[PDB]
Design a protein around this ligand. Structure first.
Ligand SMILES: *[C@@H]1O[C@H](CO)[C@@H](O[C@@H]2O[C@H](CO)[C@@H](O)[C@H](O)[C@H]2NC(C)=O)[C@H](O)[C@H]1NC(C)=O
Ligand SMILES: *[C@@H]1O[C@H](CO)[C@@H](O)[C@H](O)[C@H]1NC(C)=O
Ligand SMILES: *[C@@H]1O[C@H](CO)[C@@H](O)[C@H](O)[C@H]1NC(C)=O
Ligand SMILES: *[C@@H]1O[C@H](CO)[C@@H](O)[C@H](O)[C@H]1NC(C)=O
Ligand SMILES: *[C@@H]1O[C@H](CO)[C@@H](O)[C@H](O)[C@H]1NC(C)=O
Ligand SMILES: [Ba+2]
Ligand SMILES: [Cl-]
Ligand SMILES: [Cl-]
Ligand SMILES: [Cl-]
Lengths: 418, 417, 414
C-alpha cells in the first residue's frame, strides 16, 4: 500500500514539475523586458539643436519675373495660363506690381534653380533676427546654419555640424538658454486673393527642438509660435535605451546612410523619400540631401508631388524605419506672456523704425531652456536571463523530485544499457 | 566534536532557510507588478473621436418668448420675479429685444422641452463650420454627430457610432489630420449686464480628444481653444494594459452598462449620475442618456442641481468607478500661430461677408493630428508568478539542507511510525 | 570509458555552474532596480500650493525720492551719475515726474521697499473662487522671490490646513481673475539688465513641502486669456544607495521644516552670500542682515553669478526618496467675450482697452480624482539570489552548503 502512495506522489510531483518547467521555459522564449526609469543630476547639459522656419515660404518683394515664369504655377502666384487669378481683396499697388512681373512679352527666360529661388527669396535671418542671447551673452546669426526643409529656407541654432562644437548650458531656468526676438515680416507674405489648396491664413514661425544627431523634420515634428507673445519652452533631456530583437525592436547596426552620418528615424524617412523620388522622377526636391539634380517646376508639377503622395498611400512596406537603440529626446512645456508691454511698445517701435501696430503684429520672442540640470533615463531591461532560467528549473527540479542533470544522465545510462 | 559542529551548521542552515523561504512567500503574496514601456511603429493609426462645444450654451437670437417664460430664470435671462435685471451697460437694441421677448402680457404659453430648446437654440454646426478637412479632403457638417453635454449642443467628429467606420491616418504632421475653421459666433453670446453666479467672460470652444469607445466628458476632460489662433494639437496614441486583482484594481468582468455598449470610466460616471437623478428626482438632464422624461426648468431648479451637489460630497463613497484593463488614451501637445495673416485678413472678411474686426475675434482653426505614426504601450506585468516561487523555494531548500518535497514526505512517514 | 565521460561531465558541469553562478552574483552586485507605474483612484486630493509673481518687480507710482537715491541704480531707473536715461520714447508726465523725484537738491531697507512698493494682491485680485466658494486676498501668503513680492495660495504654512478638492474639472479648483496693472510698469527708455518687454504673470504649482523657485520652475500666463491648468498629482518613491541616489536621512535645514531639492538650493545660495558678502538678498530667508543697494552692486550679484560658474560641485543637493510632483497641461480661451467686455469695463471702472490689456483669468484644477505613483522597486533581493544559486547548484552537481562543508572535512582528514 505504501508503494502505491509513493507512486502517486512521484507521478503527481513529476507532472507538476513538467507543467511548471514548461511554464518557465515558455516565459523565457517570450524574451520579456520591463522598464527602468531613473533621474540623473548633472553639472552640465548639452543644449539641443533648434530649427525654426517662417510660415511664409518666400518673400514677395524678392520674387522676380523669371521666378514667375518658371515656378509661377508652383508658387501659386499665377494660374495655369500664366495669368493672375481672381483679384478679390487685392491692394492696387501689389496687384500692379504682380501684373507688371507677369507681363511675359518678348521675355527671354533666364536659367532657374529651385535652391537658388528658395535661398534668395526666403526670409533672411539677418532681417528676422532682432536679438539673440544664449546664457545671457550675445549670439550672432553665424551660429544659425541654413537648412532647407519643406517650409523653405530655415535656420538651425546650435546645429553642431560643419565642425562647430556644440553649446552647453551650466544653469537651468528661463534666463540661461536661447532667447531670440524675431520679426516675422508679415509685410512680405504672399498675398492671398483667391482660394487654393496651398492658401494658408497663418502667421508666425514653426520650431523643432531636436538632437544634433538627427536632421530637422519641421513639417511633422515642429510646433507653432505666434507673434505678439514671448513663448517659454521648458525642456527636459531624456536618454532612451532600447533592446534589439528578439527582446524588442531596435536598429542594432549603425546603418549609416550615404546622406547622414548618424542613423536616426528622421534620417531614415527622408532618405527613403530621397531614394524614391530619385528613382521615380530622376530629380530631387529642395529639402533632400545628396548630389542629385534638383527638380524643375514642371517636374514638380508632373512627377514629384504625385510620386510622394503615391509612396505614402500605396504601401508602408517600402519605407520601414526602425528606431535606434540609443535615442536622445527633448521634452517641452510651452507657456506664453504678452509682448510688448505698454511701457515698451514705443521704445520697440522707435528702436526698429516700425509702427506700434507693426511691432504688435510681427514681433515674437522665443525662450528655450532646460527646466533643471538633470536628465531622465528610460531603459528597457531584460526580465529573464538564462542564468535565472536555469536557476528556477534547477530549484523546481530539486524541489519536486530532487534530481539533477547527472541523475537524468544516469537514467539515460540504464536506458542505453537496456 | 564533529557531530556538534555539524549540528550547529544544520541548525543555522535550517534557520536561514526558514527566514529566506518566508521572505519569498511574503513577497509572492504581496502580488507585485512592474511596468513595461514600449514604442511601436505602425503603418496606420486609427484617428480618435474629437468632441467640441462652443463656450456659449445657446444662441441669444434663437430664444423665444415661450423659452423665456418656462426657462427664463434657469437661463439667467430673467430674475426670480420673471423680470429683467439691471440694464446697466446694456446696448439699447440688445435690451430692446429681451424686453420685448419677456413681455408676458396676454401670452398663452405653449409646451416646452429642454432638449428641444438646446437642439434648436444651440450653435448650429452648419453655421459654425466655415471649413472642414480630413487628410486633405473636404468634410461636411454631416460628418459631425450631435451629442448633448453639460455645455449644451456639442459635436463629435469621427464618432464611429450609428455604423460609421472609424477613420485612419497614414501620415503624421499638421496637414494629415482633422483641420477645421470655426466661427464661434461671439455676437450670439448671452448678454452679461449684471453679476450672477452663471456669468462667464470667456469666448471660444472646448475640445476633448477621446476614444470612440468612450462618451465625451467635456466639462472635466476638455481643453480650451481661443479665437484668433490656429491651434495645433499633436496627439500620441497610448495603449494601456492593467492587471486585475489581486495584482491591481481593474475590471475583470465586462461590466455591462444599460446606457453604453462599451465600459469606460466616463460612462460609469455619467451612469452613476443619471441613475442617482432618476432615483431622487425622477427625471434626467439633457446630457444624460436613457429613456427617462427630461426635466422641466422648475425640476432643474428645485431638485436636480442640489441633488447633484449632495451627490458630490455626501455620497462620495457611493460612486466608485473601477478602471478598465485595456484602455486607449491620447496624449496631446498644444501650440499656436496667429490667424489671420495680414495678407489673408481681408480675403477672409470678404469670403465670409464679415468685417475684419469680426474675423479677428471670431475665427479659430483647429488642427488635430498625430505627431508620428507610432503608439506607446504601458503594461503592468506580474513580477512574481507561482513558477518563480516554486523555483526559488526549491533552490534555497536544496541549497540549505538539500531536501525535497519527497524528503519532507519521508520525514512525515518516519514520524508516522 | 564510462568513468572518464562521467569525470568530464562533472568538470564541464562545474564550469557551467561557475559561470552562471558568478553571473547572478555580479548581477546582484549591480544592485538593479526597475520601475513600477500605477494609477490610484481617490475620493479626495490635497490641492497644491500655487505661487505667482507679477513680471513687473515694483509699482512705478509707489517709488519715492529716497528709493531713487539709494536704489536708483539697482532699479535701473537712474544711471551711475544719478541722471535720467535717454529721453527717447518717454511719456511727458512720466519724465516730468522722474525729473522731479530726481531733483536731488536739499534732499532705506530693501525688504521695506519690496514689501511696500510691490504689487498689492488687494488691487490685482479682481475675483477669487475656490471650489465655487469665494476666497479673500488674506488666503494668499506673501513670499519674496527674485521677481519681488509674490503670493502663494494654499501655502499651508503657519499651521493652516491644506485644502482638499472632492471633484475634478475646471470649476472645482482655484480660479482667480487678476489685473496685472500694466500702467504701473517701469518705463523702459534705455537698454538695461532689468529691461523686459513681457506683460503678464508667472506661476509655479508646487507641493506645500517645498519653497517656490519661480524664476526657474515657473510658467507664463498672458493677459487677455483665461488659461486652464489641468494638474495630475504624481507620487514618486526612489531608492537610496546602493540601489539609487536618494537622501535617506532627511537632514532638514534650519530654514525649512521639510527637506526639498529647491530648499537645499536656496539654502546653499544663502549660505554662500552670507560667507562672501555678510548680507542676504531680498528673497533669502532667515534672520541675517539684508543687503544695501551698494552691497548689491559690488558684492551680491557677482558672488551669486560666480557661485554658479566657479564651483558647481560645491552645492550638491541630493533628491529625497518621497517626492510629490504636479503635472500640468495648459490651454486658453479669450477674455472677455464681446458680450462681457462692457460689463467688466464698467464694473472695475476701466476702459475696454484696459480690460483687454490687463485682465487674465487663471483656472487651476485636477483633471480627475486620481493620482499616479511611480516607484523604483528592487529587482534582485538576497532571497532571490540564494534561491537562484541554490537551484543551479542543485541542477548542475546536486551539492549543498553541507556538501561543501563535508568536502572541507574529507579534504582536511586526507
Ligand atoms: C549606447 O549608450 C551606452 C551608454 O549609455 C553605450 O555604452 C558605452 O559604450 C562605451 C563603448 O564605446 C563604453 O566605453 C561604456 O562603458 C559604455 N557604457 C555603459 C554604461 O555600458 C553604448 O555604446 C551606446 N551604443 C551605441 C550604439 O552608441
Ligand atoms: C524708417 O523707415 C522708412 C521706410 O522707408 C524710411 O523712409 C525712414 O527714413 C526710416 N527712418 C530712419 C530714421 O531710418
Ligand atoms: C453681406 O452682409 C450684409 C449685411 O452685413 C448683407 O446686407 C448682404 O446682403 C450680404 N451679402 C451676401 C452676398 O450675403
Ligand atoms: C513615502 O510615500 C509612500 C506612498 O507613496 C508611503 O507609503 C511611505 O510611507 C512614505 N515614506 C517612506 C519612507 O517611504
Ligand atoms: C473711476 O476712474 C476715474 C478715472 O481715473 C477716477 O477719477 C475715479 O475716482 C474712479 N472712481 C472710483 C470710485 O474710484
Ligand atoms: Ba432629498
Ligand atoms: Cl514581455
Ligand atoms: Cl506591491
Ligand atoms: Cl541595472
Amino acid at each position: 500500500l505504501k508503494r502505491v502512495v509513493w507512486a502517486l506522489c512521484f507521478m503527481g510531483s513529476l507532472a507538476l514539475l513538467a507543467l511548471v518547467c514548461t511554464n518557465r521555459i515558455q516565459y523565457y522564449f517570450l524574451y520579456p523586458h520591463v522598464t527602468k526609469l531613473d533621474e540623473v543630476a548633472a553639472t552640465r547639459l548639452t543644449f539641443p539643436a533648434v530649427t525654426f522656419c517662417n510660415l511664409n515660404e518666400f518673400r514677395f518683394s524678392r520674387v522676380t519675373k523669371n521666378d514667375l515664369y518658371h515656378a509661377g504655377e508652383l508658387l501659386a502666384l499665377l494660374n495655369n495660363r500664366y495669368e493672375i487669378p481672381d483679384t478679390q481683396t487685392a491692394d492696387e499697388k501689389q496687384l500692379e506690381i504682380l501684373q507688371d512681373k507677369a507681363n511675359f512679352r518678348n521675355f527671354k527666360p533666364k536659367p532657374f534653380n529651385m535652391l537658388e529661388f528658395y535661398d534668395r527669396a526666403g526670409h533672411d535671418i539677418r532681417e528676422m533676427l532682432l536679438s539673440c542671447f544664449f546664457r545671457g551673452e550675445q549670439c550672432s546669426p553665424e551660429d544659425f546654419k541654413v537648412v532647407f526643409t519643406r517650409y523653405g529656407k530655415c535656420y538651425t541654432f546650435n546645429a553642431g555640424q560643419d565642425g562647430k562644437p556644440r553649446l552647453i548650458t551650466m544653469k537651468g531656468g528661463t534666463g540661461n538658454g536661447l532667447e531670440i526676438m524675431l520679426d516675422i515680416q508679415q509685410d512680405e507674405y504672399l498675398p492671398v486673393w483667391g482660394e487654393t489648396d496651398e492658401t494658408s491664413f497663418e502667421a508666425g514661425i514653426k520650431v523643432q527642438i531636436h538632437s544634433q544627431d538627427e536632421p530637422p523634420l519641421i513639417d511633422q515634428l515642429g510646433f507653432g509660435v505666434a507673434p505678439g507673445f514671448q513663448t517659454f519652452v521648458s525642456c527636459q533631456e531624456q536618454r532612451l535605451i532600447y533592446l534589439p530583437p528578439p527582446w524588442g525592436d531596435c536598429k542594432a547596426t549603425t546603418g549609416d546612410s550615404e546622406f547622414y552620418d548618424t542613423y536616426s528615424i528622421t534620417a531614415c524617412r527622408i532618405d527613403c523619400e530621397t531614394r524614391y523620388l530619385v528613382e521615380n522622377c530622376n530629380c530631387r526636391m529642395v529639402h533632400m540631401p545628396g548630389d542629385a539634380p534638383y527638380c524643375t517646376p514642371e517636374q514638380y508639377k508632373e512627377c514629384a508631388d504625385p510620386a510622394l503622395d503615391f509612396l505614402v498611400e500605396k504601401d508602408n512596406e517600402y519605407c520601414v524605419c526602425e528606431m535606434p537603440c540609443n535615442v536622445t529626446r527633448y521634452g517641452k512645456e510651452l507657456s506664453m506672456v504678452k509682448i510688448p508691454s505698454k511701457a515698451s511698445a514705443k521704445y520697440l517701435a522707435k528702436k526698429y523704425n516700425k509702427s506700434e501696430q507693426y511691432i504688435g503684429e510681427n514681433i515674437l520672442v522665443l525662450d528655450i531652456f532646460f527646466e533643471a540640470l538633470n536628465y531622465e533615463t528610460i531603459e528597457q531591461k531584460k526580465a529573464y536571463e538564462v542564468a535565472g532560467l536555469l536557476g528556477d528549473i534547477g530549484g523546481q527540479m530539486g524541489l519536486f523530485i530532487g534530481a539533477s542533470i547527472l541523475t537524468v544522465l544516469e537514467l539515460f545510462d540504464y536506458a542505453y544499457e537496456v
